[PDB]
Amino acid sequence: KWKTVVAIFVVVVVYLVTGGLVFRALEQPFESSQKNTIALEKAEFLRDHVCVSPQELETLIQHALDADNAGVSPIGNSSNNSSHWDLGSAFFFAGTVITTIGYGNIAPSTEGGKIFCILYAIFGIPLFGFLLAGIGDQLGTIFGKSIARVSQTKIRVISTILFILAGCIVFVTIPAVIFKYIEGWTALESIYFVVVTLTTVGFGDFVAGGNAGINYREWYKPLVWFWILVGLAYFAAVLSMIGDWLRVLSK
Amino acid sequence: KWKTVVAIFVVVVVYLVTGGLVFRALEQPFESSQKNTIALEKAEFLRDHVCVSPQELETLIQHALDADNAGVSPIGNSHWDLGSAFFFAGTVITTIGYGNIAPSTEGGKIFCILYAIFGIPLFGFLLAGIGDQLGTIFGKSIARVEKVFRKKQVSQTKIRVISTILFILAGCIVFVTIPAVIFKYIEGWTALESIYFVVVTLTTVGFGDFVAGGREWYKPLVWFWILVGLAYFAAVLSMIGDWLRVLS
Ligand SMILES: NCC[C@@H](Oc1ccc(C(F)(F)F)cc1)c1ccccc1
Ligand SMILES: NCC[C@H](Oc1ccc(C(F)(F)F)cc1)c1ccccc1
Ligand SMILES: [K+]
Ligand SMILES: [K+]
Numbered sequence: 001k002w003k004t005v006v007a008i009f010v011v012v013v014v015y016l017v018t019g020g021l022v023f024r025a026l027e028q029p030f031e032s033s034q035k036n037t038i039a040l041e042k043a044e045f046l047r048d049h050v051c052v053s054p055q056e057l058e059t060l061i062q063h064a065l066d067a068d069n070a071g072v073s074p075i076g077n078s079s080n081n082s083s084h085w086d087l088g089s090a091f092f093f094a095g096t097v098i099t100t101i102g103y104g105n106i107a108p109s110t111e112g113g114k115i116f117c118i119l120y121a122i123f124g125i126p127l128f129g130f131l132l133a134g135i136g137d138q139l140g141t142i143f144g145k146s147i148a149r150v151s152q153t154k155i156r157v158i159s160t161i162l163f164i165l166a167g168c169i170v171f172v173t174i175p176a177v178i179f180k181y182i183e184g185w186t187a188l189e190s191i192y193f194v195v196v197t198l199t200t201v202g203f204g205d206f207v208a209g210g211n212a213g214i215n216y217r218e219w220y221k222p223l224v225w226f227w228i229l230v231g232l233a234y235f236a237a238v239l240s241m242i243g244d245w246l247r248v249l250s251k
Numbered sequence: 252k253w254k255t256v257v258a259i260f261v262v263v264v265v266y267l268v269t270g271g272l273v274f275r276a277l278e279q280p281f282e283s284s285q286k287n288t289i290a291l292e293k294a295e296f297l298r299d300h301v302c303v304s305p306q307e308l309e310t311l312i313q314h315a316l317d318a319d320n321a322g323v324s325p326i327g328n329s330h331w332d333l334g335s336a337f338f339f340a341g342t343v344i345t346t347i348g349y350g351n352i353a354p355s356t357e358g359g360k361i362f363c364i365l366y367a368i369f370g371i372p373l374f375g376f377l378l379a380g381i382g383d384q385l386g387t388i389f390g391k392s393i394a395r396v397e398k399v400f401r402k403k404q405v406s407q408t409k410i411r412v413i414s415t416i417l418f419i420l421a422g423c424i425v426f427v428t429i430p431a432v433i434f435k436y437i438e439g440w441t442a443l444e445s446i447y448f449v450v451v452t453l454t455t456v457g458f459g460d461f462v463a464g465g466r467e468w469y470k471p472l473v474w475f476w477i478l479v480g481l482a483y484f485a486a487v488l489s490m491i492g493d494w495l496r497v498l499s
């Protein structure tokens with residue numbers, strides 16, 4: 001019904017205004033705090049280094065930003081020695097496109113690289129959908145056999161909560177602990193990464209195996225994408241199950 | 252069947268190796284070209300400015316990077332205003348997650364986790380709602396074509412293929428070509444960068460290398476284009492999905 005569609009639209013628009021107000025209340029004080037710090041750090045630098053003009057300072061910052069924007073860290077020569085487009089790293093980038101996560105820490109800079117990325121996404125994202133539906137069909141049988149073992153609506157609510165918590169331990173809690181010890185992040189940053197990854201939001205502020213100073217094994221990046229594949233397939237199979245049940249409720 | 256699941260897995264793994272090899276062939280020469288430039292720009296700066304040490308240079312670059320990472324441009328003298336924070340909220344819900352703006356505060360990260368968990372399904376309900384209404388529009392249009400070939404007897408699969416190609420092209424003009432032209436004139440991007448942005452936005456990949464508005468009605472109209480754009484193409488995938496389930 002269109003009456004409920006317009007109703008959900010109001011709930012969503014109110015939700016974004018609510019969200020927007022909460023985010024600005026939490027972030028704007030720190031944003032203003034950082035803005036004051038960078039202005040002071042720059043001014044104090046020019047005060048200590050008289051041989052540098054404010055104009056040639058700007059040019060150097062721009063050169064450093066353009067380098068980082070390209071994907072090359074302007075910090076040291078040793079950090080530059082590693083590549084972001086190696087056979088392994090470019091395989092994970094491909095996966096980052098296909099899963100619609102799109103971190104953005106690495107992005108195509110080449111005009112041709114952008115053209116191929118457009119075509120790669122258009123044909124590649126449905127190809128992943130087919131794989132995720134495939135694992136989603138097998139997991140649906142696993143879920144179906146587990147509910148058949150156990151009011152049908154109460155059983156189904158108890159079942160779904162258990163499956164959600166099952167995935168929350170196996171694909172959310174356990175891998176977050178691994179990232180806390182491997183990537184050296186805080187308890188929050190680790191959970192935050194896992195959540196932002198599996199929701200396919202992928203901000204890119206936290207990316208697994210991204211620190212130049214980290215001596216990460218060769219099996220790390222493929223196992224991370226494997227965790228993404230099993231983690232996304234699992235919670236997709238759960239949403240498919242809730243969707244199919246809601247369609248039965250409507251009819 | 253599990254035989255076809257393992258088959259799709261091989262196709263996908265081969266696709267990522269293929270993709271990975273193509274991306275490195277296209278990007279690694281420019282990546283090495285940039286790496287050489289930054290090393291030279293820094294070294295040439297230190298030779299011109301002798302009063303600056305190589306270490307207190309790194310410290311300044313780090314301060315500039317930490318500022319940009321926080322969302323404050325270290326070039327010249329807000330990203331969390333009522334309007335901008337509304338669009339950020341909309342970026343989370345649509346799963347686009349550009350990343351040009353991201354929660355820095357420990358509490359801001361906590362709220363972002365909870366906001367996504369409850370907010371993304373809420374969008375799914377809205378997108379399904381528009382997807383249901385558009386499905387009736389598509390369904391009534393295919394039922395019109397099938398009424399013509401009732402006595403002419405033309406395979407239902409052929410009718411369904413020509414119709415879907417038309418709906419895909421309809422969305423490609425209205426929500427892909429036309430808005431890309433607007434971004435080319437407004438944001439001042441190149442013809443490629445404009446199409447690339449629209450594609451990376453509507454696929455919800457959202458790299459964040461290109462973000463719209465980075466007038467007051469611009470940011471909400473951009474999210475409105477995103478809402479109708481995602482909903483239209485989600486209605487088309489829903490239609491192809493429902494038909495494939497009937498085929499199985
Ligand atoms: N959640 C909707 C996903 C859907 O979105 C589109 C559809 C079409 C396009 C276009 F035309 F290429 F620009 C981009 C994104 C989609 C993404 C990748 C491949 C096919 C369809
Ligand atoms: N495959 C994308 C769907 C997405 O999947 C999840 C599910 C759960 C989680 C998490 F919160 F971390 F447990 C993160 C992502 C989802 C988000 C909100 C509700 C249900 C599912
Ligand atoms: K993203
Ligand atoms: K996404």
Ligand SMILES: [K+]
Nearest residue numbers: 101201347456
């Ligand atoms: K994304």
